[PDB]
Amino acid sequence: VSLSPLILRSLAELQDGLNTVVDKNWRQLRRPGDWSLAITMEAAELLDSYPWKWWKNVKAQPDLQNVKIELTDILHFSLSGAMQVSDELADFMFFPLSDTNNALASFQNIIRLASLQRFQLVTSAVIAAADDIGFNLVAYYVAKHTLNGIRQMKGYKDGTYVKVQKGVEDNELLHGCISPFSLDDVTNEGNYKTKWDDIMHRVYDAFGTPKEERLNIGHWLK
Amino acid sequence: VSLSPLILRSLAELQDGLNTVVDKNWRQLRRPGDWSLAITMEAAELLDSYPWKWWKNVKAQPDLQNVKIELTDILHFSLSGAMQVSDELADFMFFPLSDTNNALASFQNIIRLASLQRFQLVTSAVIAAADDIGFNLVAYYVAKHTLNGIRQMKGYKDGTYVKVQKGVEDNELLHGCISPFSLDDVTNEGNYKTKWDDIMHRVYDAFGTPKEERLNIGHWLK
Ligand SMILES: O=c1ccn([C@H]2C[C@H](O)[C@@H](COP(=O)(O)O)O2)c(=O)[nH]1
Ligand SMILES: O=c1ccn([C@H]2C[C@H](O)[C@@H](COP(=O)(O)O)O2)c(=O)[nH]1
Ligand SMILES: [Mg+2]
Ligand SMILES: [Mg+2]
Ligand SMILES: [Mg+2]
Ligand SMILES: [Mg+2]
Ligand SMILES: [Mg+2]
Ligand SMILES: [Mg+2]
Numbered sequence: 001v002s003l004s005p006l007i008l009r010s011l012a013e014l015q016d017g018l019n020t021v022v023d024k025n026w027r028q029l030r031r032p033g034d035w036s037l038a039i040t041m042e043a044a045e046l047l048d049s050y051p052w053k054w055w056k057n058v059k060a061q062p063d064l065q066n067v068k069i070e071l072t073d074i075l076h077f078s079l080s081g082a083m084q085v086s087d088e089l090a091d092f093m094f095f096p097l098s099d100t101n102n103a104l105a106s107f108q109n110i111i112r113l114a115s116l117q118r119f120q121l122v123t124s125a126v127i128a129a130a131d132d133i134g135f136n137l138v139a140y141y142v143a144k145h146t147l148n149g150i151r152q153m154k155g156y157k158d159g160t161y162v163k164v165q166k167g168v169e170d171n172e173l174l175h176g177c178i179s180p181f182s183l184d185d186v187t188n189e190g191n192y193k194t195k196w197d198d199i200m201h202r203v204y205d206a207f208g209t210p211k212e213e214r215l216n217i218g219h220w221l222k
Numbered sequence: 223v224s225l226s227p228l229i230l231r232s233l234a235e236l237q238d239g240l241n242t243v244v245d246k247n248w249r250q251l252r253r254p255g256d257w258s259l260a261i262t263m264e265a266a267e268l269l270d271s272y273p274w275k276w277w278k279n280v281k282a283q284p285d286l287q288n289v290k291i292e293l294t295d296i297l298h299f300s301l302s303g304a305m306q307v308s309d310e311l312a313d314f315m316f317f318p319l320s321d322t323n324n325a326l327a328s329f330q331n332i333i334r335l336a337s338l339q340r341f342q343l344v345t346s347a348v349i350a351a352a353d354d355i356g357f358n359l360v361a362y363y364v365a366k367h368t369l370n371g372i373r374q375m376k377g378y379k380d381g382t383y384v385k386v387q388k389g390v391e392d393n394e395l396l397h398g399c400i401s402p403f404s405l406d407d408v409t410n411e412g413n414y415k416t417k418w419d420d421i422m423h424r425v426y427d428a429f430g431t432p433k434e435e436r437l438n439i440g441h442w443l444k
Contacts, residue, residue: 159279
């Protein structure tokens with residue numbers, strides 16, 4: 001249903017920090033329609049994790065691990081949209097999402113909500129989806145946030161980064177960085193920041209980031 | 223603005239024939255929401271032909287030739303949707319489409335129209351876009367229709383087809399199959415069918431289709 005407001009605020013802080021790595025003055029440069037488009041396009045990636053096409057590889061299997069990654073990407077963009085516009089559940093999300101027909105309908109409705117700039121509702125939708133599917137959305141967020149920062153360090157913005165190397169997409173390495181961590185670990189009121197820092201360092205390890213280039217949890221929090 | 227109704231009807235006939243190659247009973251198996259999803263996903267391909275991302279290869283150039291292909295793909299799906307539901311312009315398309323901001327807005331609005339199952343309006347939008355950009359939509363349709371059929375012959379539906387070979391995407395070969403043909407050639411009331419047949423054989427040539435496997439224009443027309 002919902003995250004603790006203190007956890008949500010820390011996620012928002014991380015998101016602002018990441019947006020600032022991309023551009024120092026992102027709050028002036030970006031507009032709500034940018035985040036609508038970004039969510040639309042991640043939702044298309046999410047939809048394409050399923051075998052929806054009736055004319056192309058009809059017996060393909062759903063990439064349910066990639067679903068987690070794309071929902072996490074949507075979260076980054078819905079947090080970002082919410083920092084620019086206030087929006088001023090059971091209608092548009094259909095459970096269980098393990099049913100492919102429910103997933104295709106629900107994730108198409110995320111596109112509609114994005115186009116209406118209902119970013120907070122999109123955030124609520126992703127939280128509800130992670131609860132239904134049963135994955136650790138907060139831990140996924142911290143891990144992908146870290147990979148996002150790594151990508152920026154390694155030339156994503158100037159077109160020199162390569163996402164798939166030796167048969168492995170960078171995103172795939174995140175699953176094992178996160179699996180040691182429980183839901184309680186990453187939402188505990190007193191100790192969550194240390195566990196987020198642990199996730200970050202596991203991701204930096206996975207990409208061989210030199211120690212001097214690593215940004216710890218405190219870099220991101222206000 | 224609009225095509226001749228006789229030209230539109232022949233396109234619809236070709237579309238029905240192609241849909242029948244994919245599945246004999248497509249008219250029972252498919253539902254309007256399928257075509258909405260298909261158009262959404264082609265519109266995402268269309269949007270991704272532009273350098274819209276502010277965090278990833280920011281100085282990339284638009285793939286304006288691929289725009290033509292993706293609009294043509296949308297047409298196939300909007301024709302198909304219109305065969306299942308009646309819908310029972312200047313608001314949602316913004317010219318010139320050579321302006322990237324106009325294109326991103328317009329093509330996002332195609333997604334909205336698709337989700338509303340306004341398939342005839344989507345068709346009108348594609349016709350208007352081709353008129354504005356200045357490409358031969360009918361010739362593009364016939365060429366991609368032919369490649370679509372070829373793909374089905376070569377295992378697209380069972381996952382054995384390879385779209386990009388030796389650095390060239392199959393779609394790229396279509397441009398040169400079409401460039402000899404004028405707008406008048408492919409819409410002339412008396413002779414258009416022969417010119418469509420010519421396009422088809424040029425596409426079969428490009429993919430080395432044995433003569434016995436080729437389907438001529440008459441296969442597709444009622
Ligand atoms: O201003 C931005 C731009 C991008 N992203 C992140 C969010 C997603 O997790 C990720 C998606 O990158 P792609 O793989 O689509 O390129 O980018 C941000 O957080 N802020
Ligand atoms: O029932 C169908 C399914 C697919 N297509 C065609 C339309 C598009 O031109 C093409 C897109 O194929 P992809 O490259 O997305 O897979 O498929 C049809 O015409 N009818
Ligand atoms: Mg993406
Ligand atoms: Mg992806
Ligand atoms: Mg993604
Ligand atoms: Mg496609
Ligand atoms: Mg394409
Ligand atoms: Mg396409």
